[PDB]
Design a binder for these strands. Structure first.
Lengths: 49, 255
DNA sequence: AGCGCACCTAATTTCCTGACGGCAATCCGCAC
DNA sequence: GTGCGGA
RNA sequence: UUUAGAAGGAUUGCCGUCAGGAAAUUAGGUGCGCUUAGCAGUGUACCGCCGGAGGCGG
């Protein structure tokens, strides 16, 4: 949760990440030659949770 | 005076966040303007009236925590997790989530407008830039805090600008195809995060950081950007980021 | 000072190893 | 303190 | 008032044995470097004198 300035006052914003976009980017980068990084940090039991 | 320009020169930051759910690299622009707004709020409680309404981001060197393999790819590192609140909190080994960290040397250009913009203001900024952070990272040292007049006092480096025309004007059915094709054509552009969009309506929920303000659930939005040297820059207004707020949209744009 | 060449070209063949093996430990919230 | 459920 | 706020990766180790790079050649013809100029801060710092360091005569 972060604060953002809206017109002399502030608004509190809570960020929810996108799962559908993450799947879409990873499929379309698998057959491309632009720079990419693979993150290897989650386990099988953590992903299930 | 009234208007003016202040340079924060060669700032070293260690361990800043570098993960924004699709991008591992430069931190999001909202943190870099959040540093400026936090500096404004701490300066206005010491009774030095000032208002920062534009930030410029110049990059001099970088390093990502990890290593580079033989094939040329990047493998990232993380610190060992400690104790995290929750159910499995009295255990000795904790869980590993998704994270990335970067080190940067940068210089900031601030447009200030107040009742007096002198070197005493620079001393007041110097006594306040040792308590803040930048993007969740500590500040180790700085060179000087000084006032600039023209585009010949700015040191050598590379600024970050917005290139939204090279995205909206490319070939593809959807925007992600537009981004991939625009990155295959020009190889000096990077993808960046530029703010948030709305997924709900403004109201009061239960469990907030500050329980007396207005809330909205959000999702991050992404765009394109590129680098331009100091000596090839035309004006000092074509490198300054600003806050803009429509209905449902929270953005940072150079315009 | 004010200069620092024009022309052409840079060969062909026959190959580039057989063996074995590449760690153990730990990183799961939740109903009942 | 138990076992569970999937990739 | 920053995808805010938090974090010990660590202990141990035998890469080894053998080997034929080799035969042939044509770098060649041309060419204007060239106007001007004063080396020194005085060319050295010498005999004495008081006087327990600081001074004064020629």
């Amino acid at each position: 949760q972060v604060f953002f300035p809206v017109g002399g006052s502030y608004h509190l914003l809570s960020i929810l990440p996108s799962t559908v976009l993450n799947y879409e980017v990873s499929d379309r980068l698998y057959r491309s030659k632009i720079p990419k990084i693979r993150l290897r940090l989650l386990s099988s039991n953590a992903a299930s949770t | 005076m009234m208007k003016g320009y202040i340079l924060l020169e060669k700032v070293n930051i260690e361990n800043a966040n570098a993960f924004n759910n699709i991008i591992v690299g430069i931190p999001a622009i909202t943190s870099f303007l959040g540093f400026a707004r936090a500096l404004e709020r701490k300066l206005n409680a010491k009774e030095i009236a000032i208002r920062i309404n534009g930030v410029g981001l110049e990059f001099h060197e970088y390093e990502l925590k990890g290593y580079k393999n033989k094939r040329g790819q990047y493998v990232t590192s993380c610190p060992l997790p400690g104790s995290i609140p929750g159910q499995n909190e009295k255990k000795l080994d904790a869980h590993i989530m998704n994270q990335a960290y970067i080190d940067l040397n940068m210089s900031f250009l601030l447009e200030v407008e107040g009742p007096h913009v002198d070197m005493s203001t620079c001393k007041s900024i110097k006594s306040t830039m040792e308590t803040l952070r930048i993007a969740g990272g500590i500040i180790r040292n700085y060179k000087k805090i000084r006032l600039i007049d023209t585009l010949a006092d700015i040191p050598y480096g590379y600024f970050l600008t917005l290139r939204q025309d090279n995205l909206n004007d490319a070939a593809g059915d959807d925007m992600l195809d537009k981004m991939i094709h625009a990155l295959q054509q020009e190889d000096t552009l990077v993808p960046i995060a530029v703010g948030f969009k709305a997924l709900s309506e403004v109201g009061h929920v239960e469990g907030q950081r500050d329980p007396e303000k207005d809330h909205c659930f959000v999702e991050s939005i992404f765009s394109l950007g590129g680098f331009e040297c100091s000596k090839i820059l035309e004006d000092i207004n074509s490198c300054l980021w600003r806050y803009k707020t429509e209905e449902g949209l929270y953005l940072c744009t150079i315009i």
